[model samples]
Target: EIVIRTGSGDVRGSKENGIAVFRGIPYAEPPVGAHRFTAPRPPRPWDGVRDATEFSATAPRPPYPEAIGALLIERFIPGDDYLTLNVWTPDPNAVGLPVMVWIHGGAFTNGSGSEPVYDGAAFARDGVVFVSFNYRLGIIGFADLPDAPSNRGLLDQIAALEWVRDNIARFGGDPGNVTVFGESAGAMSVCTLMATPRARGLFRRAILQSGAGNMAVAAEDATTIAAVIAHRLGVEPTAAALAHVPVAQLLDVQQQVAQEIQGAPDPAVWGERIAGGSVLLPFAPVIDGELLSQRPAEAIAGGAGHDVDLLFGTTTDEYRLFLAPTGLLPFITSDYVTAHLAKSGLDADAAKAYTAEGRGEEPGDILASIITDQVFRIPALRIAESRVDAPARTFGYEFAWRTPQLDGILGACHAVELPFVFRTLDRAASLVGTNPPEELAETVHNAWVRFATSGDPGWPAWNPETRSVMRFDHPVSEMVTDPYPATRALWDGV
Candidate 1:
């Protein structure tokens, strides 16, 4: 057992695979009972020798549908103290090592840091400190109740970073040289944190994977969502009343709302907030004038996080996981494709550009490509383009390494890059499928370590002239000039 003395207390952890592993270290006081719906509070001081060997509670969340559950791994450890973090360090006795803190993604509704695919031993082995933590999700974390604080989930992340800043030094981490990175909604949080004033200076660099800055909702829309949930529960919309409801009941109502949105994205019912389908979830960070004054992309373009080095990108075909895994690809019709294009604020003629001659793409394929660009690729490019002239550097990448799952049609789908990034391939067999490349994982994982260590990922910073982007693939990875120049051009001035 290894002991690390932290600001709150001394905790003992275990050593495995030559790295010190600490799990279930509380970064904040439990957000339960009187603390529910409030901003995260500092963890109360603990007595002698708190055990930190096992992962603690995960934030309450709904299970993913079978199609998604089949591909991604998840875990649920029921308990109230869900706002805990795990750490893997090369040497707690050493000092001033670079640190990387990871945020997991599940559409802002269904992920925890303890998920098996997020093991940090590989990163610790590479000579860096790695940290991952859980934050409140679904109605408890988001809902935007009148009596509760807005963006409590974001507040929880801020608290976690605060803990890292205060205590990571004892764990051999350099608090001043921290890098914050995440995938999906976690990536969205990274981008949003860049814009949040309270989160400034908490991390020196940022990496966003398969998500950029376009998922926040307007405050009125958040209130509307809360109202719907309140109506279903037969309670008032304020936090005071709804806080009394059972968590299971809240999740039930939250699931119903999510299902309603997915079933028939009605504009009048869900409002323009989620009806357009650009944003994936009905509940997400709200554009409250204080916590989030504006959209993350717009704030970033206006230089919100210009001082932080950024490396952000998307997988080549991010939206395919939603369409391909469930046999939904075959059911996509030309009319369905056209309607989504119009709904996404793209011209009806946009389909022609995607299906141009020699592409041999069907309606489903075209829709996936279009959605991939609109939702993931374009937003990421916008962030890179926005920061081109910032004082700090910006880099871009595209994970083009296609998975052999489902006979190679998965085509570099969303979340597929995760196992490769963490070097936790054994946990992702159902998704990666058959002989995942160790070389590719080495190349990808090493780049992340390199970036966290020195703010450079071994590539030229992206500039407007070349639009340099690294295309990560198997057997070889190469820098290329602007992928899909024509398709990218189609979204010019957007």
Candidate 2:
């Protein structure tokens, strides 16, 4: 057992197996009541020793009327005391150990750092200091009000990183050497931090798993979404009125508005951009000028943060899991494909490239490809390509290992590689199920630890010239050429 003093209080964490584990450390004050929608305030110093053994209340987990929200609610607990973090380390006194902070994914609407699948003990056992934290989600987190600050959730993340920088040393972590990693929304947050000047020097490296920067909400659309939610709640969009609204009521309004706009015709109103042949994203980090100066990919292309090392990649079949589970595979007919093209503001030729005479391959695969390319593949590739002229070292990857527990149903789906990366396959039975191959875990885990300790993960650095990628699979490592040629060409301009 070990005890460490933090701004909140003294936390006592037990040694589980070989790792020192601490849960529910507050990095900022609870964003409740009057503080709602404001930048997270620094945590108040405590009077006496406080226990940090158990996880604290999680951020509000909004329910989706469809499949995604239900899954998230099952994984996350709801509350307003959202600005909390967790850490795991090998030795509390081992000075200069590298740090890896994980941000959970739930489309920025759900998910917490405290999920069982995100347990950091495995990383700790491997000699890396692992950290995870909760940030506000949905309307409370991202909704842009005229009076309230934009991207408050992002501010919460910055607060957590600041906390890590200030206190990680006492927990045996090297404050100077930190890496930010995440999947889905979490991955988007990594990109946001990469571009934000406020996030400069917070970490030396980043690992973006299955997501990127193109997903940030545009200013106009952010205002519209916030207005819609405000109108629903019978309150003005000002910070004072919003702060008084009940949390459950706010979430209810968000669900209604999201459902109403789930398949809206105008993609621009939804805040997502159609670049190339993919649907980039509708809700994510916002470009509010103060926090984020420009689009993340643009900033990377312009040589921003040239010193930070990056490891970015996506799964091969990211969309198959989403489509198959949702039962939308059979409904993707030629007319449907044409309508989707119109909705996404794509040219008829672009639609033909994907749907080939309106009779494409499996609709599931096509839909998956569309989303995967737009949301993950293209953006990830762009980030890699932009780094060509920069001084930073960038590594790319493709998680090809399919999860067998879903009866081989989910093929390299979104976030499937998290267990492997964190080396927690044994404890993630709910996610990976029983008897996952041990060798796969060891291989991926070792690579992640290597990346945290040193910038390189034992693979050739990705450059636009070679386009080398590290493939994560059963036999585990290797460098490969560009995976999808057609998709690459399709997204060249955007």
Candidate number achieving the greatest TM-score relative to the actual structure: 1
Candidate 2 has what TM-score?
0.91
lDDT by residue (268-381, candidate 2, tens digit) is: 433343222122233466778887767787887777767899888898878765666576777776566556556556654665566552324765566666777776888888
Candidate 1 local Cα displacement, residue 477, angstroms: 1.1
Clashes of each: 0, 0
The residue-by-residue lDDT of candidate 1 on 1-494, one tens digit each, is: 99889998999999877999999999888888646698898887988999999999999888787888888858899999989999999999878999999999998889999999999999999999999999988888887877888888999999999999999999999999999999999999999999988898899999999999998977777877888889889989988887788889988898888877766667876677667654456778988888789989999999999999999889988999987887778778888888887765677777787767322278888888988988898999898889878999999999999899887778889998999999988889989986899899999999999999999999988988899989999989999987777777778866
Candidate 1 positional error at 448, Å: 0.5
Q: Each candidate: RMSD to true structure?
A: 1.7, 3.4
Full-model lDDT, candidate 1: 0.88
Task: Give the clashing residue pairs of candidate 1, or none.
Answer: none
